[PDB]
Ligand SMILES: C[C@H](O)CNC(=O)Nc1ccccc1
Ligand SMILES: C[C@H](O)CNC(=O)Nc1ccccc1
C-alpha cells in the first residue's frame with residue numbers, strides 16, 4: 001500500500017529567471033488561430049499538442065510555473081508537434097525553445113509521467129477530457145506531462161512573458177481565471193507523493 | 198513516448214448484478230455523521246477513508262459504476278479504515294462487504310493505481326485535493342484507487358441501493374449532481390490507455 005509515484009520538489013529560490021528576446025505567437029488573433037487550425041487539418045489531420053507541468057515549493061507549499069503573456073492569458077510551456085515527431089522528444093524541443101538559455105547550455109528535462117489528455121471536437125474553443133459522443137474526427141489532441149526539475153537551474157524567459165508561481169489553492173475551482181485544463185491541475189496532481197527538499 | 202498505464206475494460210453485459218439484504222448507513226443524518234466524526238477524532242485522530250473506481254464499457258464508451266442510495270446520493274464503493282489497517286487490504290475488505298456474493302465465493306480485486314487524495318479541514322462538508330493553508334490537523338483523509346475488473350463477475354447489490362453505470366460526459370462539470378470528487382473523475386481518468394475488449 002505504497003502505490004503513489006514519489007516526486008522531488010525544490011524551493012523557488014533555487015531557480016534563476018533571466019530574460020531573452022520576445023517569442024511571438026504564430027496567430028495574431030482567435031480568428032487567425034481557428035483559420036490556421038482548419039488549413040493544417042485539411043493538409044496533415046488532427047493537431048497534436050504537448051504541454052509540461054513544472055512544480056516547485058516555497059515553505060513546503062507546492063506551486064505550478066505558468067507563463068503569462070503580458071497581463072493577458074496564462075499558459076503552460078508547450079506547443080505543436082510536427083508530423084511523425086515523438087511526443088516526449090517534441091515537448092523537450094518546445095521547452096528548450098521557450099525557456100532554454102541565451103548562453104546555449106543544455107537543460108536536463110526528465111519526463112516520466114502522463115497527467116492527462118484533452119480533445120477539441122470542432123474549430124471552436126470547447127475542450128473535453130474524453131472524445132465526446134458522435135465525434136469521429138477530433139480537430140486537436142493535447143497531452144500533459146509532469147516535468148521533474150533538477151535541484152537548481154537558470155531559465156531564460158522571453159521579454160514579452162512573465163514566469164509566475166501559482167499555489168494550488170489559487171487554481172482550484174477557477175476556470176473563469178485559468179480555463180478548464182489549468183484549473184483541474186490540483187485534482188490531477190493529488191496522486192503524487194511530493195518530497196519538499 | 199508510451200508513458201500511459203494500459204487498463205482492460207469489458208462490456209457491462211459481461212457482469213451479473215444480483216441482490217442481497219439491505220446494508221444500512223452508520224449515521225442516520227448529516228448531524229449524527231459530523232457528531233461521530235468529532236467523537237472518533239478525539240479518540241483515534243484523523244478519519245482514513247478509501248474508495249474504489251470500477252470501470253466498464255458499452256459500445257466502446259467508458260462508464261463508472263456508482264451506488265445510488267434509494268433515489269438520493271451517488272457513492273463510490275468504499276468506507277472507513279480501522280486504526281493500523283493497510284489501505285489496499287482495507288479497500289478489498291470494504292468492497293467484499295458491499296458487493297461480495299450471497300454464495301460466499303471470493304472476488305478477485307486487483308488494485309495497482311492511486312488516482313487521487315482529498316482532505317476535509319473541519320467537521321463540515323467542504324473537501325479539497327490538497328491540505329489548505331493554515332490547516333495542521335485535518336479531520337478526514339480520502340484516498341481513491343482504480344480497481345481493475347476481471348472479464349466476468351457476479352456482484353450482489355444491497356436491496357436498499359441501485360448499481361448504475363454513468364458515462365463520463367454525464368459526470369463532467371456536474372458537481373451539483375455528483376459533488377466535487379465524482380464530477381472530477383473524467384479529468385483523473387484521462388491519463389489511462391483503455392482497451393475496449
Ligand atoms: C496553450 C497552447 O495550446 C500550448 N502551449 C503553448 O503554446 N505554450 C507556450 C508557447 C509560447 C510561449 C509560452 C508558452
Ligand atoms: C462516500 C463515503 O465517504 C465512502 N464510501 C462509502 O461509504 N461507500 C459505500 C458504503 C456503503 C454502501 C455503498 C457505498
Ligand SMILES: [Zn+2]
Nearest residue numbers: 058059060061
Ligand atoms: Zn520555510
Ligand SMILES: [Zn+2]
Nearest residue numbers: 046138140141
Ligand atoms: Zn487522439
Ligand SMILES: [Zn+2]
Nearest residue numbers: 255256257258
Ligand atoms: Zn457495440
Ligand SMILES: [Zn+2]
Nearest residue numbers: 243335337338
Ligand atoms: Zn493525510
